[PDB]
């Protein structure tokens, strides 16, 4: 987050737009409390049998 | 019996939606005014 905040001061419009999009995902993870490594599955849930009868 | 019908409760298709979202590895939880969890499955699906 601290690196992306420094790139937010660049004169180029494209650089500031790209750093904002990366920061939005980083901010969402920091505020929610989720961990980024939870996006890779280790155990797969199984639906209850009555909903797949 | 000649009475007025009682108050309704949670529909079953909403319970199906919660379970199907849990099969997608998404944690969906119903909360109350104080942000405390509310159990809509009558304790039938909680591991003791």
Curated annotation (Swiss-Prot), chain A:
Homology family: Belongs to the RNA polymerase beta' chain family.
Subunit structure: The RNAP catalytic core consists of 2 alpha, 1 beta, 1 beta' and 1 omega subunit. When a sigma factor is associated with the core the holoenzyme is formed, which can initiate transcription.
Role of this protein: DNA-dependent RNA polymerase catalyzes the transcription of DNA into RNA using the four ribonucleoside triphosphates as substrates.
Protein name: DNA-directed RNA polymerase subunit beta'
Swiss-Prot record, chain B:
Assembly behavior: The RNAP catalytic core consists of 2 alpha, 1 beta, 1 beta' and 1 omega subunit. When a sigma factor is associated with the core the holoenzyme is formed, which can initiate transcription.
Known function: DNA-dependent RNA polymerase catalyzes the transcription of DNA into RNA using the four ribonucleoside triphosphates as substrates.
Family to which the UniProt record says this protein belongs: Belongs to the RNA polymerase beta chain family.
Name assigned to this protein: DNA-directed RNA polymerase subunit beta
Residues of the full protein shown: 1072 to 1119 of 1119
